[PDB]
């Protein structure tokens, strides 16, 4: 599906 | 590992020239299914393998929802890692992450993986064990401080386990049945 | 501050349903719930965003959450299974990536049967008078047994003050039979205070059992959430 990323 | 489903994002910068042409590639096992590119007209998660033009069509604006905020996080990195390394506040750039869970032939996850890369030097990484990361330089410590804080690491160890071995399920069902 | 978990304590027959609420610190909109099995690492469960699904984990199909417009959420539980006993927290970030709040979590036991819940026995054992001519350090034992489920937590009460020092409480509940399961404790005391007589030494432990709404058939009192406890005297010569 694939990874949501949040920011760093 | 038989069997590996991975996904390539890429942030490239580039100043003056707009925004930063951003895109997301999965490759189930080896071979390229699905693409998603910022330099596209209208933008859209699109099917690069037959079996995958065959699934469901609310799928694929699930998909593009998330790949559109993935677009908006990863260009306020592009912003922070000049904050962190002072650079210069012009100049191209290029985030690139690599995420990924391998399985044996037994369908139990063989290793899951996740690596951070800024300019081509390594950035962070979540380690083996799937609760700790190792920072690369100075910067990518207060990264790592930020993802313990907010608790990252069981989100990306639950997405790289249960998420990404059930989807690998479904992508090779599909490819197998009909190719 | 500070995060709400309730209810704390709860025991579900194989089978039933329940409710797990949560509220998240005032104006924090992001909130997560992970699931803790006993001894085993943190699952992710699944989180909300502004009362909307953000990122979704674990949560099997039977468990259904909601933020609701006061942004605070509810956790749905059917058709439970026993697999399913284990501890949930539920963490609120004021935003998504931001520093997440913890809570104190939520003990959830799925029984094979309500009939096999039933409180502990406490037992209070003084020192033996070689130890503490020998040893001069006496260890007073306290024995919680035939309870079920473990859902216990043994305290100390020296002159009516709880006490953290000196005491070795067990890790774990020993679990004897199927439907029983045991704990124990000592607490190390200087041999010239047990030798005092004036001095109150009482063990207590604290059953979180069957809630009032659950029904209960007669034949035996129902064993609702209670703490007993067996007490000591010093005593000299």
Same mark, same amino acid.
């Given at each position: 599906r694939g990874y949501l990323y949040q920011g760093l | %590992?038989?069997?590996?489903?991975?996904?390539?994002?890429?942030?490239?910068?580039?100043? %003056?020239? %707009?925004?930063?042409?951003?895109?997301?590639? %999965?490759?189930?096992?080896?071979?390229?299914?699905?693409?998603?590119?910022?330099?596209?007209?209208?933008?859209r998660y699109e099917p690069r393998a037959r079996w995958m033009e065959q699934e469901c069509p609310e799928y694929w604006e699930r998909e593009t929802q998330k790949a559109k905020?993935?677009?908006?996080?990863?260009?306020?990195?592009?912003?922070?890692?000049?904050?962190?390394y002072n650079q210069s506040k012009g100049g191209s750039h290029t985030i690139q992450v690599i995420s990924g869970c391998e399985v044996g032939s037994d369908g139990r996850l063989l290793r899951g993986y996740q690596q951070y890369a800024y300019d081509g030097q390594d950035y962070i990484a979540l380690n083996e064990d799937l609760k700790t990361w190792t920072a690369a330089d100075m910067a990518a410590l207060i990264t790592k401080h930020k993802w313990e804080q907010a608790g990252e690491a069981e989100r990306l160890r639950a997405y790289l386990e249960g998420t990404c071995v059930e989807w690998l399920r479904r992508y090779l069902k599909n490819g197998n049945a009909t190719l | 501050s500070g995060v709400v978990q309730s209810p704390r304590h709860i025991i579900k027959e194989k089978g039933g349903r329940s409710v797990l609420t949560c509220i998240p610190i005032s104006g924090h909109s992001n909130v997560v719930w992970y699931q803790q099995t006993?001894?085993?690492?943190?699952?992710?469960?699944?989180?909300?965003?502004?009362?909307?699904?953000?990122?979704?984990?674990?949560?099997?199909?039977?468990?259904?959450?909601?933020?609701?417009?006061?942004?605070?959420?509810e956790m749905n539980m059917?058709?439970?299974?026993?697999?399913?006993?284990?501890?949930?927290?539920?963490?609120?970030?004021?935003?998504?990536?931001?520093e997440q709040y913890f809570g104190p979590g939520t003990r959830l036991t799925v029984v094979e049967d309500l009939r096999n819940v039933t409180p502990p026995k406490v037992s209070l054992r003084e020192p033996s008078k070689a130890e503490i001519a020998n040893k001069q350090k006496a260890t007073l034992q306290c024995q919680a047994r035939g309870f079920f489920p473990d859902h216990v937590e043994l305290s100390w009460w020296?002159?009516?003050?709880?006490?953290?020092?000196?005491?070795?409480?067990?890790?774990?509940?020993?679990?004897?039979?199927?439907?029983?399961y045991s704990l124990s404790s000592r607490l190390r005391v200087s041999a010239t205070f047990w030798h005092n007589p004036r001095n109150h030494f009482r063990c207590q432990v604290q059953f979180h059992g069957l809630s009032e709404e659950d029904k209960w058939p007669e034949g035996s009192p129902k064993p609702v959430?209670?703490?007993?406890?067996?007490?000591?005297?010093?005593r000299a010569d």
């Open positions: - | %590992g038989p069997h590996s489903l991975r996904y390539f994002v890429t942030a490239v910068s580039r100043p %003056g020239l %707009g925004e930063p042409r951003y895109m997301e590639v %999965g490759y189930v096992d080896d071979t390229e299914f699905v693409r998603f590119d910022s330099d596209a007209e209208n933008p905020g993935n677009e908006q996080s990863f260009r306020v990195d592009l912003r922070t890692l000049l904050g962190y | 006993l001894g085993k690492e943190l699952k992710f469960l699944i989180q909300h965003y502004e009362k909307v699904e953000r990122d979704k984990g674990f949560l099997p199909c039977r468990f259904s959450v909601q933020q609701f417009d006061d942004y605070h959420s059917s058709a439970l299974e026993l697999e399913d006993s284990a501890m949930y927290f539920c963490a609120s970030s004021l935003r998504w990536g931001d020296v002159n009516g003050k709880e006490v953290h020092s000196g005491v070795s409480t067990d890790p774990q509940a020993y679990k004897e039979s199927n439907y029983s959430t209670q703490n007993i406890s067996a007490e000591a005297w010093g």
